[PDB]
Design a binder for this molecule. Structure first.
Ligand SMILES: [Cl-]
Length: 224
């Protein structure tokens, strides 16, 4: 199974994925680039890109969900989920680093692919796209850095509160408790105890696979 450190590392690297306002390409530009971007379709379970391999280029999700995970297929830990509009591959390429997690289609999915040659050509010939990419990279890694900074030295319950608030999409968190624990350098039983307490105080609801935030203001106060 992947070590806690491998899971922690992959999960925080996966928090630098481009999304919404932070995405490196404007939607208008993704459209204009149709003859450069390759359309790639994935059945559920199919690999988009492998861990420990150099990025073949930049991936953009057009529809479906891509799971990001570490560990062998059997002992898999999911560290993040890419939604439509999300972009990955570009920061590792800029760091000259291999991917540290595997992306697998969760649902049927379609991804646009910008190969590394096309990427280099694009930045070299379209200064406006390059300039936006620069602000995007800065925004994405700085946002991750700010989340980490804010949790240092804080008691574990406050860290879990903050992590939940930051992870939430439409007030829902669908990550495993083992992964949440690894992100905080903690053990699953510790996270579970804190989640039970938050549940008793009516801050969250913990279903089978999902945590829902039921009182955001109350949870913010626990984050300190
Ligand atoms: Cl996998």
């Amino acid at each position: 199974p992947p070590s806690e450190a491998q899971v922690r590392q992959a999960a925080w690297i996966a928090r630098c994925v481009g999304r919404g306002g932070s995405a490196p390409l404007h939607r208008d530009d993704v459209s204009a680039l149709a003859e450069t971007l390759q359309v790639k379709e994935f059945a559920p379970g199919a690999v988009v890109f492998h861990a420990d391999q150099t990025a073949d280029g930049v991936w953009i999700v057009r529809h479906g969900l891509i799971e990001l995970a570490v560990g062998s297929r059997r002992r898999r830990a999911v560290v993040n989920i890419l939604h439509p509009g999300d972009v990955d591959g570009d920061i590792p390429l800029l760091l000259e680093m291999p991917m540290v997690y595997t992306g697998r289609a969760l649902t049927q999915a379609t991804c646009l692919f910008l190969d590394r040659q096309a990427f280099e050509r694009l930045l070299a010939t379209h200064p406006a796209i390059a300039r936006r990419w620069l602000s995007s990279v800065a925004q994405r890694v700085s946002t991750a850095q700010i989340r980490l900074m804010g949790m240092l030295g804080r008691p574990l319950p406050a860290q879990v509160a903050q992590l939940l608030l930051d992870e939430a999409i439409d007030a829902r968190i669908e990550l495993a408790q083992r992964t949440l624990a690894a992100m905080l350098g903690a053990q699953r039983p510790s996270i579970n105890k804190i989640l039970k307490e938050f549940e008793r105080d009516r801050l969250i609801t913990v279903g089978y696979a999902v945590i829902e935030i039921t009182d955001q203001h109350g949870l913010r106060a626990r984050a300190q």
